[PDB]
């Protein structure tokens, strides 16, 4: 009989929005197959090696179709709980954001815990931002129209970099796109009870494991750029987008970070996506509804990164 | 409520590894997570342009992590019924084959029908192989360890290229990897009746459409490099792998071509994958069972493209 996984895939393909073409000519069929089979289309993808003091980081530059000659740049940090994830796991996510925002995206492969515990991953993310600013002309982008972004632990890193950039008089940032970010290590929140059992992909036990490897023996109170929620003064940070997911155990701490930013006078667009789980920005192929939220974040980037 | 598409994805996820957070084993959870819902990692990927007589083709070179300093090369032709498909639709498949074979892969964006009818796409694929051999040093590969492969109409084109290389004293080939290939336009074979209804991704009417665009006015009997099942003498062709799929309408013509290759004295690994549909090599993210077959084909490639002897005591 039919392979059960093949059956599930055919069923899933069946529940997807019909492509709506009137006739089967080559252009139509090409378009349908491209939509099914290829990652989101961009004009150019370049694998870049970033040579920093003491370490090289892999990076990937995405330039979308229809882009300016010198487009704005979002430096992007992948999720994976500071321990897993690669340029390849988040390639589709970066293509999608570049395509919808019209901005270039530079995805950074920062060093991972436990091999490189706190504060190494955040310093990598920050130094990559600085590198991008100082090598903007080489990249072909506008270094004066700069954003950071990331999902999950990557959103944690983006938030920390926004704070580092303020604190260190680093490169000016026009936006921080925080996609269901990790912001704290209080596992007693309602979100963790409701959503952290394992039934929505990310679990509370997962997050304990991630936090453990990231921090090692460093107590969370002595790792101020880890639990960014606990930072007292969030004033003067880049305008933010904070998108949380209804069925994410991280939902409550993400909402809380958005409230604390807005309280500190930072312009924030914050929303919890109904019906969604942790990771849904990367699930747009199986979950067409994800595109609405990718477009929302992208449209905020596009607005805040426009030429003055 | 929980998004219905999300719920379906979660059910799909509920049939695969459950992470063990009682074991601090980063390199394990890594190898698992990083390889689910993500194209396989390779060391180098480069977009290149191939300049042939009268046209330029886009191509993409994949060099896997543990390839030789001067790796063997498979020239790969994407499927799509000679009408559709791109380097991007088949990028995941090429990455998987490079990773599991240890060989470089050069994916070719040949010209498509009906704009370019038979035999132009096949000539593009053959001329790209000739180009790769001629420019092996430029690619950084071993021009004396060459293979071809492809899926569906791409496997068709790979088979045609193998025949053309033999006939024209073209580059020597060590293998042809034929993944559920098109080999004939006989829509009366049993697998069309069984599998071609449309419920298994590829339909009989779909194949009639593809064949129509590829041949145009040319009768199939005058297109032997399309209907390769009608080639009389298959002896002396590159050693082959022919993987077919149980629920593919192309199953029986693929089996038939494998049988003819074997009868002509060509070494052939041929098998029909139980439970699978047309296209399943590209479906490895949702169908992890695909990997068994991807590994088998890639392993046959590795065997026949094997490196020469080198002593290690220096």
């Amino acid at each position: 009989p039919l392979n059960p996984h093949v059956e599930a895939l055919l069923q899933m393909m069946a529940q997807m929005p019909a492509p709506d073409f009137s006739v089967a000519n080559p252009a139509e069929i090409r378009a349908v197959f491209d939509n099914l089979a290829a990652p989101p289309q961009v004009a150019r993808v370049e694998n870049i090696a970033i040579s920093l003091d003491g370490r090289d980081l892999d990076a990937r530059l995405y330039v979308p179709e229809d882009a300016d000659e010198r487009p704005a740049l979002m430096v992007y940090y992948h999720g994976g709980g500071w321990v897993i994830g690669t340029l390849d796991t988040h390639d589709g996510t970066c293509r999608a954001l570049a395509q919808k925002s019209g901005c270039a995206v530079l995805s950074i492969a920062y060093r991972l815990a436990p091999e490189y515990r706190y504060p190494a991953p955040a310093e990598d993310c920050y130094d990559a931002l600085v590198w991008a600013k100082q090598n903007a002309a080489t990249l072909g982008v506008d270094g004066d129209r700069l954003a950071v972004g990331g999902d999950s632990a990557g959103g944690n890193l983006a938030a920390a970099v926004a704070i580092m950039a303020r604190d260190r008089n680093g490169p000016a940032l026009r936006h921080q796109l925080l996609i269901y970010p990790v912001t704290d290590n209080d596992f007693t929140l309602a979100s963790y009870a409701e959503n952290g059992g394992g039934e929505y992909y990310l679990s509370t036990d997962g997050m304990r494991w991630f936090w453990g490897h990231y921090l090692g023996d460093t107590a969370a109170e002595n790792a101020p750029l880890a639990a960014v929620l606990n930072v007292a003064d969030l004033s003067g940070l880049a305008p933010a987008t904070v998108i949380t997911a209804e069925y994410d155990p991280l939902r409550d701490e993400g909402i809380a970070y958005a409230k604390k930013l807005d309280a500190a006078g930072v312009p924030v667009d914050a929303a919890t996506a109904p019906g969604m789980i942790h990771g849904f920005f990367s699930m747009f192929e199986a979950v067409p509804d994800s595109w609405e939220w990718i477009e929302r974040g992208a449209s905020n980037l596009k607005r805040d990164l426009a030429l003055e």
Side-chain angles (χ1 to χ4, degrees), chain A residues 64-147:
Chain A
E65 316 262 17
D66 304 352
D68 296 335
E69 175 183 82
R70 261 198 331 155
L73 179 70
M74 175 172 61
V75 180
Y76 190 88
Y77 312 115
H78 69 84
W82 307 289
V83 178
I84 68 190
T86 66
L87 299 180
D88 287 321
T89 61
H90 282 65
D91 185 87
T93 304
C94 291
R95 291 165 167 273
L97 288 164
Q99 181 183 99
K100 294 305 188 168
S101 67
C103 301
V105 175
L106 185 70
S107 186
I108 306 307
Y110 53 90
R111 286 171 303 171
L112 297 166
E115 293 82 1
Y116 301 92
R117 301 185 196 274
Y118 182 100
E123 291 299 339
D124 284 356
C125 289
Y126 179 74
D127 288 343
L129 172 64
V130 172
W131 183 91
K133 172 71 176 69
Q134 296 189 340
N135 291 272
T138 295
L139 294 173
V141 306
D142 185 347
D144 288 320
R145 300 187 290 139
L146 202 51

Side-chain angles (χ1 to χ4, degrees), chain A residues 268-284:
Chain A
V268 178
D269 181 23
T272 296
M276 295 300 190
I277 58 168
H278 189 76
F280 78 99
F281 265 47
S282 305
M283 296 162 185
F284 56 85

Side-chain angles (χ1 to χ4, degrees), chain A residues 82 150-159 177-184 192 207 228 241-245 248-255 257-258 278:
Chain A
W82 307 289
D151 64 293
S152 197
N156 172 261
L157 291 163
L177 171 53
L178 312 182
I179 300 156
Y180 32 79
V182 178
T183 69
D184 202 11
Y192 283 103
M207 290 307 306
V228 293
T241 295
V242 185
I243 293 169
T244 45
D248 191 345
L250 306 181
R251 177 197 68 207
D252 282 359
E253 67 197 61
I255 291 171
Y257 193 66
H278 189 76

Side-chain angles (χ1 to χ4, degrees), chain A residues 41-55:
Chain A
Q41 182 156 273
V42 296
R44 193 172 44 259
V45 182
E46 305 177 24
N47 287 320
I48 287 168
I50 300 179
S51 288
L52 302 175
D53 191 56
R55 67 243 189 252

